Design a protein around this ligand. Structure first.
Ligand SMILES: [Mg+2]
Ligand SMILES: [Mg+2]
Ligand SMILES: [Mg+2]
Ligand SMILES: [Mg+2]
Ligand SMILES: [Mg+2]
Ligand SMILES: [Mg+2]
Ligand SMILES: [Mg+2]
Ligand SMILES: [Mg+2]
Ligand SMILES: [Mg+2]
Ligand SMILES: [Mg+2]
Ligand SMILES: [Mg+2]
Ligand SMILES: [Mg+2]
Ligand SMILES: [Mg+2]
Ligand SMILES: [Mg+2]
Ligand SMILES: [Mg+2]
Ligand SMILES: [Mg+2]
Ligand SMILES: [Mg+2]
Ligand SMILES: [Mg+2]
Ligand SMILES: [Mg+2]
Ligand SMILES: [Mg+2]
Ligand SMILES: [Mg+2]
Ligand SMILES: [Mg+2]
Ligand SMILES: [Mg+2]
Ligand SMILES: [Mg+2]
Ligand SMILES: [Mg+2]
Ligand SMILES: [Mg+2]
Ligand SMILES: [Mg+2]
Ligand SMILES: [Mg+2]
Ligand SMILES: [Mg+2]
Ligand SMILES: [Mg+2]
Ligand SMILES: [Mg+2]
Ligand SMILES: [Mg+2]
Ligand SMILES: [Mg+2]
Ligand SMILES: [Mg+2]
Ligand SMILES: [Mg+2]
Ligand SMILES: [Mg+2]
Ligand SMILES: [Mg+2]
Ligand SMILES: [Mg+2]
Ligand SMILES: [Mg+2]
Ligand SMILES: [Mg+2]
Ligand SMILES: [Mg+2]
Ligand SMILES: [Mg+2]
Ligand SMILES: [Mg+2]
Ligand SMILES: [Mg+2]
Ligand SMILES: [Mg+2]
Ligand SMILES: [Mg+2]
Ligand SMILES: [Mg+2]
Ligand SMILES: [Mg+2]
Ligand SMILES: [Mg+2]
Ligand SMILES: [Mg+2]
Ligand SMILES: [Mg+2]
Ligand SMILES: [Mg+2]
Ligand SMILES: [Mg+2]
Ligand SMILES: [Mg+2]
Ligand SMILES: [Mg+2]
Ligand SMILES: [Mg+2]
Ligand SMILES: [Mg+2]
Ligand SMILES: [Mg+2]
Ligand SMILES: [Mg+2]
Ligand SMILES: [Mg+2]
Ligand SMILES: [Mg+2]
Lengths: 98, 170, 136, 48, 96
RNA sequence: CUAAUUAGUGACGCGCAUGAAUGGAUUAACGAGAUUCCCACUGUCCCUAUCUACUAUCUAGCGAAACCACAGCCAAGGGAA
RNA sequence: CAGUCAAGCGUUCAUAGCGACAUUGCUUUUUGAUUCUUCGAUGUCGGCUCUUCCUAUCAUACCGAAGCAGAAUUCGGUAAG
RNA sequence: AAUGUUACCGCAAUAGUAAUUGAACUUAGUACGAGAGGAACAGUUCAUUCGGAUAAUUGGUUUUUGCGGCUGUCUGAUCAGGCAUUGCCGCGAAGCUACCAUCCGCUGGAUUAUGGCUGAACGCCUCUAAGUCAGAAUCCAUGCUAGAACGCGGUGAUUUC
RNA sequence: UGUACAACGGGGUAUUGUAAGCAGUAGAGUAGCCUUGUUGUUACGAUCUGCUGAGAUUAAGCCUUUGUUGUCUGAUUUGU
RNA sequence: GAAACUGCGAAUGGCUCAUUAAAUCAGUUAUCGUUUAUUUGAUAGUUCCUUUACUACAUGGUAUAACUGUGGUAAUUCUAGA
């Protein structure tokens, strides 16, 4: 079971829901309901339709903490200095001077 | 689906096969670069944080960071780009590509250890493999050993032992 | 459908009653197909036989090579406009009505099929599956 | 009460949809426990 | 988790968002029967044991639900749970 | 012309019984004139569904007509069949 | 529309399937013959709609024959669900 | 209406009655045949015609005159509205609704034709005379709809100014 | 006279597509006063943006409710 | 000295005669109307900074192939993660 997404509005489409349209060029369009489908047939442009996802993304509407900072990072600091070089003597030369 | 996991600290890699779609399901709708806590995936991995690095679906098409989508498209790939190796100068090609959002259609999820859990993984933390090659360029030798250029790099270069018959070389 | 079809088809909404004209989607030289009958269809007083995706119809060619015209031949419906429903629960539809001219066995007259094809049809007629590009 | 929709895997060897998912309509009837207040016995007669 | 599933797992009952249109919430045990039943919503109904034993192969199939639609029936329901709605819609002018 | 045409049109003519102001033939333009096909259009149809108003319907007041041998459940029989 | 006789047909073989010369019938969606009812009025052909009935059965169930190897077909029975 | 009143739960006389046809896979390139050709039963998956429901889904319907948009004019402007036989357009819940949508359509017995058993008449022989086995989209039940307003049962409570 | 019933109000559900108001360095531009501009100023301008997935509507046969206000003995008839 | 990186070549060659009728092409012109890898000949003392507590010049930076290792696809001169 996959939940699809309307190719106009950006709404989730649960199974059995809405309609599917196969265009002449074999591009597939899925609408959650007859509303988006009609708008679509009207050549309306989602970015000009206020309630759509594409419109809200473009006009940057309430994205908020998604652009806020997050914590993902790491630390390693280990050594396996060279292959065939007898690494036993590689940690001895590794104390340096400074 | 198969999990291909790497420990970048030791240079170790081992795979894993996870059935039981509920355990897999933790990765679904997750993009590349997002971390994943281990316990959900299994008990063997607990407290292990996994970075999603990529993978291939059935039919073998590779994921490409940045496309989003949980699906395949056909892009036009230039030089210096992933999932393309140009055969000729200025040669671009149009090729099928899998999205960067994880889904059930994947054959293999590639992962990278970030934080280690509370239990040792068989072929990962237990074994370590050496860096194949050492510093070549002058200052790079100096900066691997921190030499503060006085110390005459010629002594500090790495030397590899090789055996020919009863003759052992360097 | 009937003769030469490997397998069975699940019922799909009937979109093309007798008299409908659909695009001819192969390279045979025909521009369109005028449906005069549907194979395997039944009988009710006043009911028009109608074709659905995957069905075999009898047809004439209204626009096309004069050698194709003025005669009745078999053809197979590869695309519907009327919405139908699959068992995976989706209502879907194409942008046009189209079929391809074929012999009673199900073998195709032309070498290729332009445009998408419905899988219900592809599964039903092997020869159509061969010559098809994007399916569904 | 009403109806809703269901998704489930179909087990039907030989069917094109064997092992595939199908989506199906179902009704729902509200059935709180019934309570027993009595018994009637019936006897057979030539009139029924 | 009446309306939940081995596969779905999310805690929810079979009551749709906004509740069964023209009925209510279903706070007791229930029978979920495939397809449709004679009579209308709110009507008294009798369910009866079969008068024979079906082999049929269509009977005897042992079903396992993957998912039960809990979306609203009072319009075109876009959401299974108020959680899912808040998840997708973000925050609104009433809210917190 | 159509898949298919007692239709239409173009030809043919020992034409039951065409034919020259009993006017013959031709004819642009015009026609709520008869006929044929085509494009568009469409609930004419496949195959039906839904909505609005006013009716019907129930109430107050008002209040006709047609028709009427006697009347009003059938099957068969005979009988002006 | 259906029989009886059986000379013929059917490579041979009357009657698998047929069948002359003759002859006995049945039917009342043919057409005639009649003129009984209706001329102080029983609204015409066809179609559309819709119900029911008949069986001399086209299909579908189960059978018996064959000049029935199979496949196909033909003849016949119970059959109008 | 009336068989005391009123209520609940039931019986079943009689009457009605319903399901229908095809294809594919497989059997099987098998049986049969010199070859050319070439089946069926059991099993499976779909379909046709018909029927009874139902509205989760999809579609149709719009006076939800619900939200928005538009022309013309009228209220000084604004806001907010009126008028144009529902002014017009897009979307539009609810309801209704569609092989344009989904679901559901039972199994026992007795028989016909016909093939038989035992078996005389007729020392032999015969399915028939006596007796008898198997048997059809038939018929009778099962099941389904009504419930006799002059067919019936079980049960509850039964009035004082 | 009580998980009573009703009229409102609240919350959910659903439909539309961002209300009025105010503000702006958004705006083809246009005028008026001079102290004639080293953003000169006062305003005006289809439209645009912000507060604003807002505002409006939502049972008339949607769901729900610890809130408010109210309602809770009229008429007729029946017996073995 | 494999592999790979870098550089250069792959715009030459070979083939065909479809288009093309003031086009091409030919002889003759023009660049005071432009671009030109290459070959050949020439051609570069100046690079920092309010210009004493000074700038790596004895020479500054990583990030990658090949490789190692873990992989995906029926399938290609496909390629992913480490
Ligand atoms: Mg709709
Ligand atoms: Mg619509
Ligand atoms: Mg007709
Ligand atoms: Mg081919
Ligand atoms: Mg509802
Ligand atoms: Mg609804
Ligand atoms: Mg003619
Ligand atoms: Mg005509
Ligand atoms: Mg003529
Ligand atoms: Mg003539
Ligand atoms: Mg004559
Ligand atoms: Mg004269
Ligand atoms: Mg004359
Ligand atoms: Mg003239
Ligand atoms: Mg005219
Ligand atoms: Mg009337
Ligand atoms: Mg009244
Ligand atoms: Mg009155
Ligand atoms: Mg009057
Ligand atoms: Mg009578
Ligand atoms: Mg009598
Ligand atoms: Mg004779
Ligand atoms: Mg013989
Ligand atoms: Mg003879
Ligand atoms: Mg006749
Ligand atoms: Mg007379
Ligand atoms: Mg007469
Ligand atoms: Mg008369
Ligand atoms: Mg009279
Ligand atoms: Mg009269
Ligand atoms: Mg009459
Ligand atoms: Mg013989
Ligand atoms: Mg028989
Ligand atoms: Mg009948
Ligand atoms: Mg009394
Ligand atoms: Mg075979
Ligand atoms: Mg032979
Ligand atoms: Mg029928
Ligand atoms: Mg309006
Ligand atoms: Mg105006
Ligand atoms: Mg204003
Ligand atoms: Mg006025
Ligand atoms: Mg007027
Ligand atoms: Mg609706
Ligand atoms: Mg039906
Ligand atoms: Mg019986
Ligand atoms: Mg015997
Ligand atoms: Mg017998
Ligand atoms: Mg007997
Ligand atoms: Mg006898
Ligand atoms: Mg039957
Ligand atoms: Mg039964
Ligand atoms: Mg039944
Ligand atoms: Mg009664
Ligand atoms: Mg009683
Ligand atoms: Mg806004
Ligand atoms: Mg009402
Ligand atoms: Mg309150
Ligand atoms: Mg009140
Ligand atoms: Mg050349
Ligand atoms: Mg870098």
């Amino acid at each position: 079971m996959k939940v699809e997404i309307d190719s106009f509005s950006g709404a989730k489409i649960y199974p059995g829901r809405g309609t599917l349209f196969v265009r002449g060029d074999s591009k597939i369009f899925r609408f959650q309901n007859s509303k988006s489908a009609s708008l679509f047939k009207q050549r309306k442009n989602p970015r000009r339709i206020a309630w759509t996802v594409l419109f809200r993304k473009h006009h940057k509407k309430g994205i908020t903490e998604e652009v806020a900072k997050k914590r993902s990072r790491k630390t390693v600091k280990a050594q396996r200095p060279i292959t065939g070089a007898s690494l036993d003597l590689i940690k001895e030369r590794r104390s340096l001077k400074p | 689906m198969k999990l291909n996991i790497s420990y970048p600290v030791n240079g170790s890699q081992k795979t894993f096969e996870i059935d039981d779609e509920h355990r897999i399901r933790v990765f679904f709708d997750k993009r590349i670069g997002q971390e994943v806590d281990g316990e959900a995936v299994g008990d063997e991995f607990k407290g292990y944080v996994f970075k999603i690095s990529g993978g291939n679906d059935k039919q073998g098409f590779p994921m490409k960071q940045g496309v989003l989508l949980p699906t395949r498209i056909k892009l036009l790939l230039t030089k210096n780009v992933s999932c393309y190796r140009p055969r000729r100068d200025g040669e671009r090609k149009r090729k099928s590509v899998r999205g960067a959002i994880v889904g059930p259609d994947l054959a293999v999820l590639a992962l990278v250890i970030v934080k280690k859990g509370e239990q040792e993984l068989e072929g990962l933390t237990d074994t370590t493999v050496p860096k194949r090659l050492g510093p070549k360029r002058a200052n790079n030798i100096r900066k691997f050993f921190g030499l503060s250029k006085e110390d005459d790099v010629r002594d500090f270069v790495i030397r590899r032992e090789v055996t020919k018959g009863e003759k052992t070389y360097t | 459908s009937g003769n030469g079809a490997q397998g069975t088809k699940f019922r799909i909404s009937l979109g093309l009653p007798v008299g409908a004209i659909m695009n001819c989607a192969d390279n045979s030289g025909a521009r369109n197909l005028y449906i005069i009958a549907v194979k395997g269809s039944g009988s009710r007083l006043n009911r028009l036989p109608a074709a659905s995706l995957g069905d075999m119809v009898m047809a004439t060619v209204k626009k096309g090579k004069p050698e194709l015209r003025k005669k009745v031949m078999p053809a197979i419906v590869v695309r519907q406009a009327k919405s139908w429903r699959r068992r995976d629960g989706v209502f879907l539809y194409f942008e046009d009505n189209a079929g391809v001219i074929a012999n009673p066995k199900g073998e195709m007259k032309g070498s290729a099929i332009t445009g998408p094809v419905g899988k219900e049809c592809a599964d039903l007629w092997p020869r159509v599956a061969s010559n098809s590009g994007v399916v569904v | 009460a009403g109806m809703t929709t269901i998704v489930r895997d179909l087990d039907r060897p030989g069917s094109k949809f064997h092992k595939r998912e199908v989506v199906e309509a179902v009704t729902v009837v509200d059935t709180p426990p019934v309570v027993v207040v009595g018994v009637v016995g019936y006897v057979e007669t030539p009139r029924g | 988790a009446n309306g939940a599933t081995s596969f779905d797992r999310t805690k929810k009952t079979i009551t749709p968002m906004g509740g069964f249109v023209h009925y209510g919430e279903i706070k007791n045990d229930f029978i979920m029967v495939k397809g449709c039943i004679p009579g209308n919503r709110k009507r008294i109904v009798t369910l009866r044991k079969s008068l024979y034993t079906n082999t049929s192969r269509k009977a005897l199939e042992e079903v396992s639900l993957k998912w039960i639609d809990t979306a609203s029936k009072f319009g075109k329901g876009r959401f299974q749970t108020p959680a899912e709605k808040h998840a997708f819609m973000g925050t609104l002018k009433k809210d917190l």
